[PDB]
Design a protein around this nucleic acid. Sequence first.
RNA 1: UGGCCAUGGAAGUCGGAAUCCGCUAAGGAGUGUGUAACAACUCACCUGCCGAAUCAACUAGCCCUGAAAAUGGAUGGCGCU
Lengths: 163, 198, 52, 416
Amino acid sequence: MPPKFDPNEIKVVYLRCTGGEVGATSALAPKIGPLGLSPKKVGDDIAKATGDWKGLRITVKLTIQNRQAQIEVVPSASALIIKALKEPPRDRKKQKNIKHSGNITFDEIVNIARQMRHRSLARELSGTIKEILGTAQSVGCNVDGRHPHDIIDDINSGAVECP
Amino acid sequence: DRATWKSNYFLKIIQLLDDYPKCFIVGADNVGSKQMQQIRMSLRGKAVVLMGKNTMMRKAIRGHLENNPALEKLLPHIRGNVGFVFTKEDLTEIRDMLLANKVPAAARAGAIAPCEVTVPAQNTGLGPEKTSFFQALGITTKISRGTIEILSDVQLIKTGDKVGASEATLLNMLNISPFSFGLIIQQVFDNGSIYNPE
Amino acid sequence: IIEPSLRQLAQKYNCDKMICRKCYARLHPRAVNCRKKKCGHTNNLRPKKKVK
Amino acid sequence: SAADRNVEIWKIKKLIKSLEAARGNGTSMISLIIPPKDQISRVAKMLADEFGTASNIKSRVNRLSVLGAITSVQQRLKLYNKVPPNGLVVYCGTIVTEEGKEKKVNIDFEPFKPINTSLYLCDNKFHTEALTALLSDDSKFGFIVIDGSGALFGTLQGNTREVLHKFTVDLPKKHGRAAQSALRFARLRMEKRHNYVRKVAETAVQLFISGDKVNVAGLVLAGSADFKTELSQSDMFDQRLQSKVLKLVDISYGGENGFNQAIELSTEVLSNVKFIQEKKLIGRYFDEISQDTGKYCFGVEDTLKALEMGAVEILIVYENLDIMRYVLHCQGTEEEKILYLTPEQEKDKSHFTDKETGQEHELIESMPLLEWFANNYKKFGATLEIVTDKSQEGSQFVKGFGGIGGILRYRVDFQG
RNA sequence: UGGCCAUGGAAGUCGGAAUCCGCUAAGGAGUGUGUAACAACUCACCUGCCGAAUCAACUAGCCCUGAAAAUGGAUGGCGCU
């Protein structure tokens, strides 16, 4: 890849975001795509197949190019997984009003969200991670009909289970 | 706020003095937040890093609190850009862990040179670009087919020498980072006894 | 074309200033108020526009 | 609403596509258009004598068809009681289609724009040359007929001639028969005469502007008496409005009768204008080529690749391409793709065997490109600009570059 | 943390509903500058030199800015600080 056209190994990674479905406006390939042998329409269809049936409400796409075979993965963003565990699925075109119902409980489901965090956060274990994701919810509004803010301070759960 | 926060930090530093009888005084220096995040991750479990000011000038009050002397010896060494490392493992081992961590950080234009910096004979990694920046001071550089190659191993900056601006920028373009350090140790506190990196 | 430190020297003296909104007086960049009595020490200042 | 209007245009375009195709063996088809002002009775009578005539048609299959259509177009007109505004467009007949299926049809509708183009025909086919010529010419032009007597403000489509607003004035007498007062009365006359102009120049803003942007692509001023000029070159007439002063036309007559005169003396300029704007746009396209820049594109492959991605700003297309998007499909594996084929490459092509598997890759029917853009240019990057091969810059675009490309929103490198 | 809405692109930065937690010494779901979009730059909390007072918003008195006309010109004049 430096001088002319040579794949020594090629396990090259670059981080695209978004991908419910194909996208006409795309912006998937160019620039990085064609130079490096990854095409455009085929790479888009492979990106659709990976991020197909969940997530359809926005995702992320790390693209590991094995010379010509692209490996699309869905690395979790906190907000994205909360929207995945909402009241699905009215995907696109009404829709419309809008995507912010945000009364879907998730109590022990968020335990899974904090566990799957790629370490990160420089935390002192889950006790603080609970607060982190327990706020990241812009939409969800926490348990049944609660607020986020100060209910977080009196957590009585999952301190030793998340490691 | 900032009265309750000031009193709350007093309660942090006093608790970190009660918990650990052993501390390590490190200079912050030209240091990033990213560097401080890295040093928090590596020395996460055992040690607790802290960064105070002249509410560190308050170790007096801990010594007042119906117990400690010896902390009176530590007050003069809380000058410069100071940050503590509270811990319970050992002294000479932690000194080696602090020395081993560090970070590169590119050239500071104007500041002193700690070691004899060199420029190895190698391509820059560019097209037909300005060779005049390199050749202005006194470096042998040719355009050997596109890439600007330096043709000899030459020492630009010696020990205790002031780093010029143009030579610093060329080193930054080449990705040569001997300058800076990361953080330095000034003094030590070990269960009452004081040490100076020995 | 022109050496970058020297440029910035010469920029200081020409381009890096504040200009009074009233009397278009050229003022040192630290300025909060105009010099000029004709404008009555306006305080409506602005930064001289930069060449692109 | 704008979206509902775009749907009604698409509806009518699709209706035209079908009516141009239709055809019927033997038979004739009532082309018909009843302009806004008309009395429908007048149309009923016309039809009734057209009926009576048709009953002496010698051919049977033609005769009985025409009589049938005229019987049925009368019944459509019975359901309206005044002529709908914006005209009426009826299209009877006995169209033939596949399966050997002789079918009667009676399409009437008020067309969305007003139109000023009557027409009646029996012939083997339907005639929709009027209708296409009212979708093509959007270009609304504003007219203002100043005169000493009075004013007239009015809009104008290809054929259609609207009257927005008007007034007249009692301006003063030319002369003051005292020696001293002569001078004062003159100065005073100048003030009321100017004031009238001030009023016109405001009213034109009030009428021909909408949301801080003029709704008319020109603004023809007309009249006599060195007045239209007094407006034209004043500080009172708003500069965004006065930017689009397109003509000062010296007309005889004034007011409404003044209007038509002002249009016939304007005809030449309103044609040139549509070409002038075209020349200007493509001129910029070429500027980006002339300088290195990078923000242009050309040839479907590149252009659509630019559109798909971080899109184009403006997409320029010669109003008829031949070039056509086909949807290719496999028999066994169900693998599919789409391609943009030229008139020669689309008609006959041995390329379309599947090769890897080894089957005949069948090409399921096309959707012609310019129309493809028109459908879905909005789902990209926008401003679909139809162009022509009349200007020298126009032809160079059509001939050389292929009548397809677009000005891009930023610099892009292309490869292969 | 490409946070949500917005895809025409807004990962703090045309707009708008939001607007919390972690690490925190401390950094706003972000003042700007700049971006197609980023990047890059810029704007709290704390230190070192430093070393006792210092800053903001209003308000009103005199003075000034606001303040342009035609014979040469009038706090009555000279003049007056």
